[PDB]
Amino acid sequence: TRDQNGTWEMESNENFEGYMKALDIDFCTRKIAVRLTQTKVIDQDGDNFKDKTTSTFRNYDVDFTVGVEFDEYTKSLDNRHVKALVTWEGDVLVCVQKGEKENRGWKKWIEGDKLYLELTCGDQVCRQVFKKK
Amino acid sequence: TRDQNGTWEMESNENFEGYMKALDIDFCTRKIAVRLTQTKVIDQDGDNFKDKTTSTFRNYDVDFTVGVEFDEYTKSLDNRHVKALVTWEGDVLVCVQKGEKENRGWKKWIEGDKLYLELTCGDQVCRQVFKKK
């Protein structure tokens, strides 16, 4: 049929690497585009089309209750099982990710309208700040 | 303030490489995760949090009309300038991308509730199958 209207999600992708190498796309760029899923939104009205293709790199989503230990699987990070626990220390949201890697956790808090994130794992600390959209 | 509600977009991302290396994340993944802006959406009800963090790898919007040639700049993938002509072949949307690469183009058609996309460049053929939602 010619009616290509609707939102479509990639379920298979054959020889995406060979086609990208034929376009002289860089090495690390190809090895990830093969792994990622793609969503295609098409608005077709008559002879005019509008194709919006989006490939999401990371789509993490976790729920929790402060003070209640829960099982966390970092699917889109390292894909490991950690028993996370989120507690309050002042107004800072502190978390401990009990698992194989030692000193793993994060701290989250706002001051003004900036979300601060302190991702820690072993000897490394990652600092990220966010603006309100 | 403990209220972390809202949609937050990444401002800075310091030492994401070191934090990802501490989690044994591969090199190519680190080289791309470092260069992407993240968006955090927190739905908070007291101590019940809903944290969803997403990052977009590729996004591409194209507007074209069947039978009218248009200048296409492949924002994703290739970043080359091609003159694309999209035409109907029965129920198959056939497009030719006249440019640097020989035999560059794609074919798109619907069968049932699935979108089939065949990308062609040189002697390489990439076949992508989508599913209507």
Curated annotation (Swiss-Prot), chains A, B:
As given in the record, the signal peptide range reads: none
Protein name in the entry: Retinol-binding protein 2
Q: What does this protein do?
A: Intracellular transport of retinol.
Q: Which SUPFAM superfamilies match?
A: Lipocalins
Instruction: Report the GO molecular function annotations.
Output: fatty acid binding; molecular carrier activity; retinal binding; retinoid binding; retinol binding
Q: Where in the cell is it found?
A: Cytoplasm
Tell me the organism's taxonomic lineage: Eukaryota, Metazoa, Chordata, Craniata, Vertebrata
Q: What keywords sit in the KW lines?
A: Cytoplasm, Retinol-binding, Transport, Vitamin A
Its GO CC terms are: cytosol; nucleus
- UniProt: all-trans-retinol binding residues: K40, K108
* UniProt keyword Transport present: yes
Q: Which GO terms describe its biological process?
A: epidermis development; fatty acid transport; vitamin A metabolic process
Concerning Pfam families, the annotation shows:
Lipocalin
Q: Which gene encodes it?
A: RBP2
**What does the entry's free-text domain comment contain?**
Forms a beta-barrel structure that accommodates hydrophobic ligands in its interior.
Record InterPro entries: Calycin, Fatty_acid-bd, ILBP, Lipocln_cytosolic_FA-bd_dom
Which superkingdom is the protein from? Eukaryota
What is this protein's tissue specificity according to the annotation? Higher expression in adult small intestine and to a much lesser extent in fetal kidney.
Q: Give the similarity note.
A: Belongs to the calycin superfamily. Fatty-acid binding protein (FABP) family.
